[PDB]
């Protein structure tokens with residue numbers, strides 16, 4: 001059993017955008033790191049129908065790259081609006097104890113909002129990965145717009161998981177006007193603009209209760225004019241794709257880095273890559 005393990009997560013509200021072919025940078029493998037676990041979460045439209053027949057390229061390109069490095073895909077789960085994939089180095093897996101399980105929760109009759117939780121155990125420690133999606137206009141269990149449901153929160157279980165990650169666009173925005181928000185961005189006053197971010201509000205309302213986000217030093221990841229680093233000020237600049245972490249059992253989870261990937265400009269949101277070291 002190792003004392004520690006490393007986890008990379010990436011999420012991207014990628015909308016209708018085709019998957020990129022440079023996956024190495026997206027997964028944080030391009031400086032030669034070899035994480036134990038990799039989770040990838042996407043939000044968008046039309047994944048399950050998969051009109052563009054992107055599913056086949058994804059599988060082929062990801063499996064190429066990751067199978068070479070020792071990874072096994074634990075699960076891919078696709079809905080109309082969300083994608084969650086979890087990989088782990090094959091050398092950590094015991095078939096007999098893995099208890100690899102996923103649930104899908106949907107909140108609306110069109111199955112467009114809700115979330116996905118994938119969990120598995122290695123070395124007698126349980127990991128859970130959540131992604132979620134909510135629209136501004138939906139009527140919800142929380143009577144808020146935030147992409148939280150207690151059914152997706154494995155920290156509220158009777159037997160809570162040891163390491164928990166929640167990755168995606170939480171539908172948390174920056175609650176101030178665009179002028180003021182842009183001024184703070186231009187001043188690099190990231191903490192000043194985070195003062196207006198709605199995660200703290202969601203937490204006051206007991207949503208994402210006890211979940212921690214790594215310190216944010218990067219500029220808002222939305223809304224960009226595609227292929228540029230210029231904000232489109234039709235929306236207040238906001239942190240859309242987030243990574244939250246928790247333990248249910250007093251385990252240490254240490255963020256190593258947390259950053260938006262500015263090289264992926266093809267769309268209005270920039271992906272966010274987080275790296276953690278967990279102590280078993």
Ligand code: HEM
Pocket residue numbers: 012014015016017018019020026040042044045046047048050051052053054055056058059060062063073076078083085
């Ligand atoms: C229109 C856009 C997209 C569509 C329709 C789509 C559709 C799909 C489908 C159908 C699968 C499952 C394929 C199968 O199991 O046979 C899949 C897997 C996947 N997609 Fe997407 N996707 C899209 C965008 C993206 C984007 C932007 C990413 C970003 C990296 C991404 C990452 C993944 C990953 C990692 C898998 C699992 C690959 C594997 O290891 O087998 N997808 N997608």
